[PDB]
Amino acid sequence: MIINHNLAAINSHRVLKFQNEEVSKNMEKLSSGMRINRAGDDASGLAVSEKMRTQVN
Amino acid sequence: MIINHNLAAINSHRVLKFQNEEVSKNMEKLSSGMRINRAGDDASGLAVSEKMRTQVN
Amino acid sequence: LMNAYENTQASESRIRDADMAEETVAFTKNQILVQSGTAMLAQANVRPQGVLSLL
């Protein structure tokens, strides 16, 4: 076996980190209590929510 | 006995290398929890999975 | 200030902090490499011993 590189380890690390990113996103979504906390989740939805907030105020 | 080549060693190395390839392929299945990550494990199943993912979204 | 501080800390951590899972594999790889190198060296010391059969 090629001991100069652990390709399976690299793949596992990659998928683990890209799952950790999603779990962090879900954790922050849970903590904030709002579906759209940061921007970019949906720009149209964020803008609509902002102007409806203005309307209710 | 011929010493310029080790046929038993060659055969064992071949089977060992292909077993390592098999186990490496099986590893990502557990790493990601998905039956089909790299296209080639199946084709029709991957296509219908993508189509139904678009449908569910 | 709270928002800026948390984002600033995240940005700083993205640069200076190390990902343990990222290079613990490299650490194990280098341990295997150093063990193989030590084995091959120790094999190399006894290489010239075959000359003594001619004396």
CA distance A22 to A15: 11
Q: Which residues of B touch A15 (CB under 8 A)?
A: 28, 31-32
Q: Which of C19, C21, C29 is the closest to A6 by Cβ?
A: C29
User: What are the distances in angstroms from CA C10 to CA A10, A53, C3, C5?
Assistant: 24, 29, 11, 9
User: What is the resolution of the experimental data for this entry, in Å?
Assistant: 3.3
Do the Cβ atoms of A37 and A43 come closer than 8 Å?
A: no
Output DSSP code: residue A3. T
Distance of CA A38 to the CA centre of its chain: 9
What lies within 8 Å, CB to CB, of A35 at 6+ separation is A29, A41
Contact of B24 with chain A, judged by CB distance below 8 Å, is answered with: yes
Which tokens go with A30?
Answer: 């849970």
- Asked if A touches C (at least 3 Cβ pairs < 8 angstroms), the answer reads yes
| d(C-alpha B18, C-alpha A9), whole Å | 18
d(CA A49, CA B7): 73
The DSSP line for C7-54 is: HHHHHHHHHHS--HHHHHHHHHHHHHHHHHHHHHHHHHHTGGGGGGGG
Give the technique used to solve this structure.
Answer: cryo-EM
Could you count the other beta carbons within 10 Å of the beta carbon of residue B35?
11
Q: Where are the alpha helices (DSSP H) in chain B?
A: 7-32, 44-56
